[PDB]
Amino acid sequence: IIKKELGLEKDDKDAIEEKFRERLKELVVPKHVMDVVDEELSKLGLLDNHSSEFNVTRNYLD
Amino acid sequence: GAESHELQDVLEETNIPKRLYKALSLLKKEFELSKLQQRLGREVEEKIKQTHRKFLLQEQLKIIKKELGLEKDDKDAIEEKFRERLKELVVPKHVMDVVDEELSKLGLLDNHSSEFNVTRNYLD
Amino acid sequence: GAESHELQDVLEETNIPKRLYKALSLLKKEFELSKLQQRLGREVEEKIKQTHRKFLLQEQLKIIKKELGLEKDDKDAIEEKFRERLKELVVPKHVMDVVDEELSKLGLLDNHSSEFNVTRNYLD
Amino acid sequence: IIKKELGLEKDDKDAIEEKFRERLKELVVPKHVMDVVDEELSKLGLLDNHSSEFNVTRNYLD
Amino acid sequence: IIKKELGLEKDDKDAIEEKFRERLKELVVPKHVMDVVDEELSKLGLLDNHSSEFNVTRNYLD
Amino acid sequence: GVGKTSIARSIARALNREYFRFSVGGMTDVAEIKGHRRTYVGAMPGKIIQCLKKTKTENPLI
Amino acid sequence: HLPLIAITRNPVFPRFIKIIEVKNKKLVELLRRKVRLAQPYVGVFLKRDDSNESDVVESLDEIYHTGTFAQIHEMQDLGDKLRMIVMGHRRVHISRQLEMVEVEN
Numbered sequence: 001i002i003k004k005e006l007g008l009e010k011d012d013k014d015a016i017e018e019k020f021r022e023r024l025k026e027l028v029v030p031k032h033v034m035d036v037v038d039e040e041l042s043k044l045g046l047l048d049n050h051s052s053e054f055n056v057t058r059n060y061l062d
Numbered sequence: 063g064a065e066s067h068e069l070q071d072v073l074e075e076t077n078i079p080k081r082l083y084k085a086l087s088l089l090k091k092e093f094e095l096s097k098l099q100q101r102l103g104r105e106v107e108e109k110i111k112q113t114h115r116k117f118l119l120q121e122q123l124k125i126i127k128k129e130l131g132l133e134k135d136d137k138d139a140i141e142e143k144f145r146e147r148l149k150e151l152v153v154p155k156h157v158m159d160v161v162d163e164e165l166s167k168l169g170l171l172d173n174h175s176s177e178f179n180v181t182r183n184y185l186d
Numbered sequence: 187g188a189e190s191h192e193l194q195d196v197l198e199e200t201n202i203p204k205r206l207y208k209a210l211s212l213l214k215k216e217f218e219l220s221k222l223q224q225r226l227g228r229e230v231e232e233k234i235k236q237t238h239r240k241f242l243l244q245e246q247l248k249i250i251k252k253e254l255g256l257e258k259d260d261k262d263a264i265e266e267k268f269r270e271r272l273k274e275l276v277v278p279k280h281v282m283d284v285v286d287e288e289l290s291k292l293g294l295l296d297n298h299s300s301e302f303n304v305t306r307n308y309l310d
Numbered sequence: 311i312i313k314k315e316l317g318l319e320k321d322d323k324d325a326i327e328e329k330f331r332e333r334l335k336e337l338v339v340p341k342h343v344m345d346v347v348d349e350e351l352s353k354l355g356l357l358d359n360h361s362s363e364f365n366v367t368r369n370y371l372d
Numbered sequence: 373i374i375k376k377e378l379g380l381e382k383d384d385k386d387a388i389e390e391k392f393r394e395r396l397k398e399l400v401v402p403k404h405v406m407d408v409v410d411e412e413l414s415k416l417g418l419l420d421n422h423s424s425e426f427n428v429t430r431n432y433l434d
Numbered sequence: 435g436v437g438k439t440s441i442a443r444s445i446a447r448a449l450n451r452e453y454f455r456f457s458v459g460g461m462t463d464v465a466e467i468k469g470h471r472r473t474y475v476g477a478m479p480g481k482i483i484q485c486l487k488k489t490k491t492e493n494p495l496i
Numbered sequence: 497h498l499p500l501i502a503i504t505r506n507p508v509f510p511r512f513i514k515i516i517e518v519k520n521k522k523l524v525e526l527l528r529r530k531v532r533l534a535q536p537y538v539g540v541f542l543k544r545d546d547s548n549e550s551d552v553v554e555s556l557d558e559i560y561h562t563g564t565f566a567q568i569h570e571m572q573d574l575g576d577k578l579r580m581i582v583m584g585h586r587r588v589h590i591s592r593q594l595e596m597v598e599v600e601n
C-alpha cells in the first residue's frame with residue numbers, strides 16, 4: 001500500500017540510469033568497473049538533478 | 063443583462079421578428095458569458111482541490127520514503143560510503159578522528175562549492 | 187479481490203454451502219483490505235482538517251482581539267522609525283529615492299524573509 | 311475574554327515560550343536581545359511546531 | 373473578463389517600466405538595447421520584487 | 435616529410451582498425467595523458483580516453 | 497487438444513467476460529489456426545503460485561486442472577495483435593491433465 005501511492009508512471013525519473021545501462025549491455029564490462037558504475041548510479045538516484053555533484057557524477061558516468 | 067445601449071437598439075427595432083431575434087442574440091450572448099463564468103469557476107475550484115490532494119499525496123509520498131530518496135541528502139551518503147569502506151580496515155584512531163573532522167566539515171559545507179569538492183577529494 | 191489460490195480453493199469446494207460461505211468470507215476479507223487502503227488517505231485528510239481547524243482557532247483568537255490582546259508588531263512602524271531617524275538630515279535626492287524603493291520593498295517583503303532581513307540591515 | 315482566549319492557546323510551542331521566558335527572567339539582559347528574541351518568538355508562533363526551519367529557529371533560541 | 377477585480381494590480385506597478393521607457397524616449401536609442409530592455413522588462417514582470425533576481429534585473433535596467 | 439603520418443593512416447585503414455594521432459612535442463603537462471582529477475568542474479580525462487571514445491574500440495592505431 | 501492458454505495474470509471468473517493479452521506472438525499462430533473452424537472454441541484455465549511462462553512452455557502441470565470452456569467471441573486487433581476474449585460458459589475440472597480427454601464435471 002505504501003509503494004502504490006501516486007505512481008504517475010513512477011514519476012518518470014531515472015531514465016538516464018536505464019539509458020547508460022543499455023549503453024553498457026552491448027559491452028563486456030569488467031567486474032570492477034561495473035561495480036563502480038553501480039555505486040555511481042546509486043548515488044545518481046539519490047541526488048537531485050540540479051546539484052553540481054549530480055552534474056559531475058553524470059558527466060563522469062557518461 | 064443587456065446594457066442600456068443594446069436595449070435602446072432593440073427598442074429602435076419596430077419589426078417584431080427582428081427585435082425578437084435580437085433579443086435571442088442578447089440571450090445567447092449572456093448564455094455564453096455565464097457558461098464561461100461557471101466553467102472558469104469550476105476550473106478554479108477543481109484546481110484548488112487538486113492542490114489540496116497534492117498536499118495529501120505529498121505527505122503520503124513522505125510515507126513512501128521510509129528513509130528513501132531525499133533522506134540521504136547526497137552527502138551523508140558519502141559519509142556512509144567512507145565509513146563502510148574503512149570499516150573492514152583496522153584503522154588508526156588518529157586518522158579515524160581526522161576522518162570524523164573531515165566529515166563534520168563536509169556537513170558544514172554546501173554541495174555546490176569548490177572548497178567542498180576539495181574536501182571530498184582529500185577524503186577520497 | 188481474493189488471490190488466485192482463494193479461487194482455487196473455492197473451485198475445489200464441491201459443496202454449495204461450503205463454496206458460498208467461503209466466497210462470503212473472501213468478500214469480507216477483500217472489503218477490509220480495500221477499505222483500509224481508502225482509510226489511510228481518509229485519515230490523512232482527517233489529520234489535515236483537524237490541524238487546520240486548530241490553526242483556525244488560533245486565527246480566531248488572533249483576529250478577534252485585533253491586536254487588543256497583543257500589541258502592534260511595529261513592523262509597519264519601522265517605516266516611520268527610519269524616516270524620523272533620517273527626517274532631520276539635510277540630504278541629497280538620489281539617496282531619498284533609493285530609500286523609498288527600499289521602503290517599498292520592505293512593505294512588500296514578508297517579515298520572516300531572509301531577503302527582508304538583509305533589507306532591514308541595509309536600511310539600518 | 312481576551313485573557314481566557316490567550317490561555318486556551320497560550321504556548322507557541324509545547325513548554326517552549328514559557329520556559330525560555332522564565333529562563334530569561336533571572337537574566338539582567340540588554341534591550342537588543344529582548345527585542346530580537348521577541349521578534350524570533352513572534353515568528354515562532356507564526357510558524358508550526360514541526361517545520362524544519364522552525365526547529366532551526368528553536369535551536370537558535372536554545 | 374481579465375479586468376474584473378485586481379487588488380494586486382496596485383502593487384508591483386508597471387509604472388517603473390513606463391518610467392524607464394519615457395526616460396529613454398527622448399534619446400535616439402539603438403534597436404539592440406531596445407529589444408534587450410523589452411526582454412528584461414518582460415522577465416522582471418514575470419519576476420516578483422521579493423525575488424533578489426528581480427532586484428539584480430532592476431539594477432541592470434538602471 | 436617522409437609520410438610517417440601518411441603510412442600511419444595507411445596501416446590503420448589496411449588493418450581495418452581505427453586511427454588517432456597525438457602531439458607531445460614541446461609538451462610539459464602530465465595531465466593530458468592522465469587527464470584531470472574529475473573533481474574540478476570542467477576537468478577532462480586523459481586524451482587517450484577521448485581517443486578510445488571516438489574510435490569506440492580498444493584496438494586503435496594510436 | 498490445443499495448447500494451454502497463458503493466463504499471464506488475467507483471471508477469468510465463471511460467467512464474467514474478460515480480456516487476455518499476451519506479449520509473445522506464439523498465440524497468434526494458434527488463434528489463426530482455429531479461425532477456419534465453423535465454431536471456434538477456447539478453453540480457459542487458472543495458474544498456480546510461482547507464475548512462470550518458462551514453466552508454462554516446459555510443463556503443463558503449472559496450469560490448474562480447473563478451467564472454464566467457452567466460445568471465442570470476436571476479433572478486434574485495435575492496436576495490439578492479441579486481444580483474446582474469454583468468457584465463462586462451462587466449468588470443467590480435468591481428471592488428469594498429463595494425458596484431450598475432459599469431462600464437464
Ligand SMILES: Nc1ncnc2c1ncn2[C@@H]1O[C@H](COP(=O)(O)OP(=O)(O)O)[C@@H](O)[C@H]1O
Pocket residue numbers: 435436437438439440
Ligand atoms: N614514399 C611515399 N609514398 C607516398 N607518399 C609519400 C612518400 N613520401 C612522402 N610522401 C608524402 O609526403 C607527405 C609528408 O607528410 P608528413 O606528415 O610530413 O610525413 P612525416 O611525418 O614522415 O614527415 C605525406 O602526405 C605523404 O603522402
